[PDB]
DNA sequence: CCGACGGCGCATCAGC
DNA sequence: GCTGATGCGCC
DNA sequence: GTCGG
């Protein structure tokens, strides 16, 4: 909150570039600068001081100077007043509507929540569910509720097969007091990098969570990644809990450390870490860390038996999950 | 100046 | 049906 | 939009 006005401004600029401009590198650049400013431990007094930080350049420094002088940014004040930009930015808040679909919808005169609700026939399945729960998905999840959700998922998973291990990742594993959604890493010794010794491993778990009415909707589903909706049960006469997003990712059991590093995030931390790996001659994905050859082609997977091993390869001191909230 | 910017799963579509 | 391009999503 | 080469 120390430089919250500036990081809010940069986040709004990032969203504009992603949703309206469709300028994905500008989006990433703005989020990177907002993240580096968010952890900077001083109240920023000038654009020059901010430009010292890596990721903040000349253009952001000038916007920081304007924002500290006036409390606002004329560029954003004008974007806020533009009906098409404002409409597009709103529509992209529905899950499954991206910058392309939002511009298409605005083109056909579908521009509000009410318009969406009467044009449900114009939405794909993902978008219809995103619209159905629009308000619920805007709410954060208190850690106490994440603990209740963890208990259900971990206990239901054990009832399918005691050899499953489910791990809640995301901001929850980084120790946050609130989470945007619930991200669950799933393993089972039958599914490794060397063989899938049993089918339906993810299906069986999804079906079980549907059976006890935890999972209520599905946005997308494949053999390794489920994206859906869930909901805590409420006690007698209690108001219902909000519907929540849930992501489940089944990772080969022998590649758990790369998988949990990936799924713990944060997303900017991952981008920073994988970019630094490239600079050190490695490429990291959710499965493996591999060397890069003279030709820049990826080599064979390096041995890994801890999250820390991955940090070593790229010459980073180990950072606990709680210090990866970039 | 210029090229690179993290890496990948699932849904939808056009072309064959 | 398949493949590759694209869109949207995940951290 | 920013950065290293
Ligand atoms: Mn999450
Ligand atoms: Mn998620
Ligand atoms: Mn609801
Ligand atoms: Mn670079
Ligand atoms: Na969206």
């Amino acid at each position: 909150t120390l430089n919250g006005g500036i990081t809010d401004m940069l986040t709004e600029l990032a969203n504009f570039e992603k949703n309206v401009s469709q300028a994905i590198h500008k989006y990433n650049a703005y989020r990177k600068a907002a993240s580096v400013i968010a952890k900077y431990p001083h109240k920023i007094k000038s654009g020059a001081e901010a430009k010292k930080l890596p990721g903040v350049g000349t253009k952001i420094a000038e916007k920081i100077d304007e924002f500290l002088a006036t409390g606002k940014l004329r560029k954003l004040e004008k974007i806020r007043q533009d009906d098409t930009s404002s409409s597009i930015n709103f529509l992209t808040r529905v899950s499954g509507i991206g910058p392309s679909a939002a511009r298409k919808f605005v083109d056909e005169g579908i521009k509000t929540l009410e318009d969406l609700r009467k044009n449900e026939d114009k939405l794909n399945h993902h978008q219809r569910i995103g619209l159905k729960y629009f308000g619920d998905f805007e709410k954060r999840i208190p850690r106490e509720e994440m603990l209740q959700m963890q208990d259900i998922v971990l206990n239901e998973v054990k009832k399918v097969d005691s050899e499953y291990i489910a791990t809640v990742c995301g901001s929850f594993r980084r120790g946050a007091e609130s989470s945007g959604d619930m991200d669950v890493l799933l393993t089972h010794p039958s599914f490794t990098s060397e063989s899938t010794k049993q089918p339906k491993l993810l299906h069986q778990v999804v079906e079980q969570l549907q059976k006890v009415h935890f999972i209520t909707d599905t946005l997308s589903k494949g053999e390794t990644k489920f994206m859906g909706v869930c909901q805590l049960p409420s006690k007698n006469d209690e108001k219902e809990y909000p519907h929540r997003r849930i992501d489940i990712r089944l990772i080969p059991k022998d590649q758990y450390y790369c998988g949990v590093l990936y799924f713990t995030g944060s997303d900017i931390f991952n981008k920073n870490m994988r970019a630094h790996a490239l600079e050190k001659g490695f490429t990291i994905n959710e499965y493996t860390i591999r060397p890069l050859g003279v030709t820049g082609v990826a080599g064979e997977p390096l041995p890994v038996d801890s999250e820390k091993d991955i940090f070593d390869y790229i010459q980073w001191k180990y950072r606990e999950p709680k210090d990866r909230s970039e």
mmCIF file of all heavy atoms in Angstrom, chain D residues 1-2 4-5:
data_model
loop_
_atom_site.group_PDB
_atom_site.id
_atom_site.type_symbol
_atom_site.label_atom_id
_atom_site.label_comp_id
_atom_site.label_asym_id
_atom_site.label_seq_id
_atom_site.Cartn_x
_atom_site.Cartn_y
_atom_site.Cartn_z
ATOM 1 P P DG D 1 4.446 2.928 -24.479
ATOM 2 O OP1 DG D 1 4.562 4.036 -23.513
ATOM 3 O OP2 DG D 1 5.154 2.984 -25.783
ATOM 4 O "O5'" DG D 1 4.964 1.606 -23.765
ATOM 5 C "C5'" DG D 1 4.515 1.289 -22.467
ATOM 6 C "C4'" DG D 1 5.657 0.761 -21.623
ATOM 7 O "O4'" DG D 1 6.007 -0.579 -22.050
ATOM 8 C "C3'" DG D 1 6.943 1.578 -21.660
ATOM 9 O "O3'" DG D 1 7.483 1.610 -20.343
ATOM 10 C "C2'" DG D 1 7.829 0.804 -22.656
ATOM 11 C "C1'" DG D 1 7.343 -0.639 -22.489
ATOM 12 N N9 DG D 1 7.324 -1.422 -23.727
ATOM 13 C C8 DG D 1 6.746 -1.065 -24.921
ATOM 14 N N7 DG D 1 6.846 -1.982 -25.847
ATOM 15 C C5 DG D 1 7.509 -3.028 -25.214
ATOM 16 C C6 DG D 1 7.899 -4.287 -25.715
ATOM 17 O O6 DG D 1 7.713 -4.745 -26.848
ATOM 18 N N1 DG D 1 8.553 -5.051 -24.745
ATOM 19 C C2 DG D 1 8.797 -4.633 -23.459
ATOM 20 N N2 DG D 1 9.449 -5.498 -22.667
ATOM 21 N N3 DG D 1 8.435 -3.448 -22.980
ATOM 22 C C4 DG D 1 7.796 -2.706 -23.904
ATOM 23 P P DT D 2 8.941 2.222 -20.039
ATOM 24 O OP1 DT D 2 8.928 2.693 -18.655
ATOM 25 O OP2 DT D 2 9.322 3.105 -21.168
ATOM 26 O "O5'" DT D 2 9.884 0.938 -20.078
ATOM 27 C "C5'" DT D 2 9.710 -0.061 -19.095
ATOM 28 C "C4'" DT D 2 10.758 -1.127 -19.249
ATOM 29 O "O4'" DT D 2 10.588 -1.781 -20.525
ATOM 30 C "C3'" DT D 2 12.197 -0.594 -19.216
ATOM 31 O "O3'" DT D 2 12.884 -1.229 -18.143
ATOM 32 C "C2'" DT D 2 12.770 -0.942 -20.615
ATOM 33 C "C1'" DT D 2 11.862 -2.076 -21.061
ATOM 34 N N1 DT D 2 11.685 -2.234 -22.533
ATOM 35 C C2 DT D 2 12.013 -3.435 -23.118
ATOM 36 O O2 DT D 2 12.503 -4.363 -22.503
ATOM 37 N N3 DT D 2 11.762 -3.509 -24.461
ATOM 38 C C4 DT D 2 11.192 -2.533 -25.256
ATOM 39 O O4 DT D 2 11.006 -2.697 -26.447
ATOM 40 C C5 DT D 2 10.850 -1.300 -24.584
ATOM 41 C C7 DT D 2 10.235 -0.165 -25.358
ATOM 42 C C6 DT D 2 11.098 -1.212 -23.265
ATOM 43 P P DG D 4 19.695 -4.448 -18.485
ATOM 44 O OP1 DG D 4 20.010 -4.869 -17.109
ATOM 45 O OP2 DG D 4 20.052 -3.077 -18.914
ATOM 46 O "O5'" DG D 4 20.408 -5.471 -19.472
ATOM 47 C "C5'" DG D 4 19.771 -6.688 -19.765
ATOM 48 C "C4'" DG D 4 20.444 -7.370 -20.935
ATOM 49 O "O4'" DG D 4 19.923 -6.846 -22.180
ATOM 50 C "C3'" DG D 4 21.957 -7.219 -21.003
ATOM 51 O "O3'" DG D 4 22.505 -8.435 -21.470
ATOM 52 C "C2'" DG D 4 22.157 -6.062 -21.994
ATOM 53 C "C1'" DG D 4 20.943 -6.196 -22.914
ATOM 54 N N9 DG D 4 20.386 -4.924 -23.377
ATOM 55 C C8 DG D 4 20.328 -3.736 -22.683
ATOM 56 N N7 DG D 4 19.733 -2.777 -23.346
ATOM 57 C C5 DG D 4 19.363 -3.374 -24.548
ATOM 58 C C6 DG D 4 18.680 -2.835 -25.660
ATOM 59 O O6 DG D 4 18.256 -1.685 -25.809
ATOM 60 N N1 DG D 4 18.507 -3.779 -26.671
ATOM 61 C C2 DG D 4 18.931 -5.083 -26.606
ATOM 62 N N2 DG D 4 18.669 -5.848 -27.677
ATOM 63 N N3 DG D 4 19.569 -5.604 -25.568
ATOM 64 C C4 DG D 4 19.749 -4.695 -24.577
ATOM 65 P P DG D 5 24.077 -8.604 -21.737
ATOM 66 O OP1 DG D 5 24.291 -10.067 -21.593
ATOM 67 O OP2 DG D 5 24.882 -7.655 -20.938
ATOM 68 O "O5'" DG D 5 24.216 -8.266 -23.290
ATOM 69 C "C5'" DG D 5 23.781 -9.238 -24.230
ATOM 70 C "C4'" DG D 5 23.840 -8.705 -25.646
ATOM 71 O "O4'" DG D 5 23.091 -7.464 -25.734
ATOM 72 C "C3'" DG D 5 25.251 -8.385 -26.165
ATOM 73 O "O3'" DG D 5 25.407 -8.915 -27.483
ATOM 74 C "C2'" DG D 5 25.280 -6.853 -26.167
ATOM 75 C "C1'" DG D 5 23.831 -6.564 -26.516
ATOM 76 N N9 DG D 5 23.392 -5.213 -26.221
ATOM 77 C C8 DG D 5 23.652 -4.478 -25.092
ATOM 78 N N7 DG D 5 23.114 -3.287 -25.118
ATOM 79 C C5 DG D 5 22.450 -3.241 -26.339
ATOM 80 C C6 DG D 5 21.690 -2.204 -26.926
ATOM 81 O O6 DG D 5 21.427 -1.084 -26.461
ATOM 82 N N1 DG D 5 21.211 -2.567 -28.180
ATOM 83 C C2 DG D 5 21.425 -3.781 -28.783
ATOM 84 N N2 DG D 5 20.875 -3.953 -29.999
ATOM 85 N N3 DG D 5 22.136 -4.759 -28.243
ATOM 86 C C4 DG D 5 22.619 -4.417 -27.027
#
